[PDB]
Ligand binder design. Sequence first.
Ligand SMILES: CCC(=O)Nc1nc(C)cs1
Length: 175
Amino acid sequence: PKEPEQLRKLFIGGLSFETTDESLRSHFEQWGTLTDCVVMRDPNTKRSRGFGFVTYATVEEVDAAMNARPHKVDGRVVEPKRAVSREDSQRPGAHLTVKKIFVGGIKEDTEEHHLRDYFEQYGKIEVIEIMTDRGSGKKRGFAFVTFDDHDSVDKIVIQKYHTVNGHNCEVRKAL
Ligand SMILES: CCC(=O)Nc1nc(C)cs1
């Protein structure tokens, strides 16, 4: 019944070196129950590595925290990011932080408003590009959507399914 823990974590980059497990928790508990919260430190010096992780009890709590950005934690604006699968990563353990998606499988009957009406609930859209053939102008059956922020893309690509205009679509991070 609980969402997988991986989908409930936020990496928090850019921490003040004075941020502690306790102060990171106090801050992020404003948006949900935290089942875990840790500042990464050097194993010998105990000096902060400048990043940490928080784990919420639910995905809706992750969303609430992301919607409350920018977060100023102990005087410094931090960089929260949610996890995505390796298929949308540039190397194991690394986050491909992009604002654009490829949307495939939309065929020739899908229009800009279909993509806008669906994707606007993931984030603020800046560009919709329905791809057409360079020679004929016919729709090629794929599109790109650019958002104002990467978390929209991260939420999108972790869904198993996207149904747009009745088509089951393939969605991936782009560039
Ligand atoms: C530095 C690597 C990185 O960004 N790690 C991330 N972990 C999660 C959980 C999201 S991004």
